[PDB]
Amino acid sequence: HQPLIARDGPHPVEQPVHNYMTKVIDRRALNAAFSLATEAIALLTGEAL
Amino acid sequence: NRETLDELESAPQTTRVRADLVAIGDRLVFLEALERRIYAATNVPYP
């Protein structure tokens, strides 16, 4: 919402304004991995101890 | 004659206001840059 100031005399008359704009969200996805090797699996889950 | 008959006021309201004070020699003057205060979005040029 904007103000205004009264102009004196030979000018057009300033009437108030309201400005509305909506903004749309950017979406993005971050990827990151971590692996695990085959002999490391059978140790941690058991059944190879 | 001797007139001196200018009347005085009633000691009006004395508020505190964030204004800007400097001193130039003997005199003590405001500073005022009236753009962000009174002319920000008003779309009328600064005089």
Residues of A in Cβ contact (< 8 Å) with B35: none
| Method used to obtain the model | cryo-EM
Say yes or no for a CB contact (<8 Å) between B42 and A7: no
State how far the Cα of B28 lies from the Cα of B9, in Å rounded to an integer: 23
Q: Cα–Cα distance between A39 and B17 in angstroms, integer?
A: 76
Is A5 within 8 Å of B42 when comparing Cβ atoms? Answer: yes
Specify the resolution in Å. Answer: 4.1
Query: CA geometry: angle at B18 spanning B15 and B21, to 5°?
Result: 105
Nearest CA in chain A to B45: A5
**Sign of the torsion formed by the C-alpha atoms of A8, A10, A11 and A13:** positive
CA distance A35 to B39: 61
